[PDB]
Amino acid sequence: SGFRKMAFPSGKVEGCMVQVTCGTTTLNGLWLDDVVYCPRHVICTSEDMLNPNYEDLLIRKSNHNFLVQAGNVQLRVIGHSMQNCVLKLKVDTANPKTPKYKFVRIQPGQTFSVLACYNGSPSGVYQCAMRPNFTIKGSFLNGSCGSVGFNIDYDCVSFCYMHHMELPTGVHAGTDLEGNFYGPFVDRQTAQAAGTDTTITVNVLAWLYAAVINGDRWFLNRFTTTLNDFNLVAMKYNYEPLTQDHVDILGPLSAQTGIAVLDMCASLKELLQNGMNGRTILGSALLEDEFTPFDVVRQCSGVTF
């Protein structure tokens, strides 16, 4: 019993964190095999950030301008290349702690663990979700750039995020490990803002199924809805549209609890209209959208209370 925002154990990622220094800028890098991956803005000064020409800044650098530190050891850079918004530094030592890994690009609504780091040293781990507006509501201070997001289903680490910047509203933007940004963001200090955010409907439904599995049914009702009528109501509360894909994905949780997806959609509609009336669901007074259907299945018991 219980339901917590749970992160993956971070040990496999901690053994990959390094500090990358170029001139006066210091940030974090990910050392996998003989390559260190880090945000390309490590080659920039504060002035450069308005309209940096990264190709022009990079051509002026040599291998020995990049200082890479792994623990108390200095790694030697023997090559460098840029791939989108990530810089790849070839080093002369393969990381003996390199886990089994993949680079995966995730979709909005997907969750992942973040290992927040400063000076190549991990400070904390937390769970978060890629918002529908492609930002993440993280906890990052200056010096956290290069900190990574990941999942560890089985013993393979799937790296999905690398931290690059903080937007004016306090939310965060970054790239996959191939350097492609999530959303319409650029690694430039130009006026950029997060788009209007929405609630991840499929995740709220998954969390309502987690509440039923753990023994709570106060929010259920005798009604059902069509998918179209549910979406017309959902859009009015800034909830993401629910697709047939989402309904299919919720199939296993529906079979475990005996509650049809469109019947759970009817409880959600009613919760949006009424609020909670002093009650909580899994210890929360708000509808939680940072647990996916897969996260609920992984954390919750297979036997409904």
Residues with catalytic annotation? Answer: 41, 145
Residue of 105, 100, 159, 101 lying closest to 134 (CA atoms): 105
In the numeric block, the tokens 């918002």 are attached to 131
* Shortest distance (Å) from residue 52 CB to ligand RKC: 9
Site membership for ligand RKC, residue 303 (CB under 6 A): no
* Shortest distance (Å) from residue 33 CB to ligand RKC: 25
* Shortest distance (Å) from residue 55 CB to its own copies: 31
* Shortest distance (Å) from residue 169 CB to Cl ion: 24
- The residues, ordered by sequence, that sit 6+ positions from 39 with a Cβ below 8 Å of its Cβ are 27, 85, 86, 87, 145, 146, 162, 163, 164, 175, 187
Backbone Cα Rg of the chain: 22
Q: Which of 188, 214, 237, 294 binds ligand RKC (CB under 6 A)?
A: 188
Instruction: Classify 249 as helix, strand or coil.
Output: helix
Q: Which amino acid is located at 13 in the chain?
A: V
**Quick one: what does residue 11 bind among its own copies, Cl ion, ligand RKC, none, with the CB cut-off 5 to 8 Å set by partner type?**
its own copies
**Quick one: what does residue 106 bind among Cl ion, its own copies, ligand RKC, none, with the CB cut-off 5 to 8 Å set by partner type?**
Cl ion
Instruction: Please state the length of the chain.
Output: 305
Site membership for ligand RKC, residue 134 (CB under 6 A): no
Q: Which is nearer to ligand RKC, 28 or 198 (CB)?
A: 28
Site membership for its own copies, residue 3 (CB under 8 A): yes
Q: Which is nearer to Cl ion, 22 or 202 (CB)?
A: 202
Q: Which of 6, 106, 220, 297 binds its own copies (CB under 8 A)?
A: 6
In the numeric block, the tokens 């001139």 are attached to 23
| Cβ atoms of residues 41 and 50 within 8 Å | no
Separation CA 178–CA 76 (nearest Å): 22
The window from 197-205, 220-228, 236-244, 283-291 that contacts its own copies (CB under 8 A) reads 283-291
Give the contact letters, 166-205, x = binds to its own copies (CB under 8 A), - = no: x---xxx---------------------------------
| Cβ atoms of residues 23 and 45 within 8 Å | yes
| Cβ atoms of residues 91 and 34 within 8 Å | yes
Q: Which is nearer to its own copies, 144 or 225 (CB)?
A: 144
For 24, 131, 144, 150, the CA distances from 106, given in Å and listed in that order, are 33, 11, 21, 10
Q: Which of 164, 179, 268, 289 binds ligand RKC (CB under 6 A)?
A: 164
* Shortest distance (Å) from residue 135 CB to ligand RKC: 12
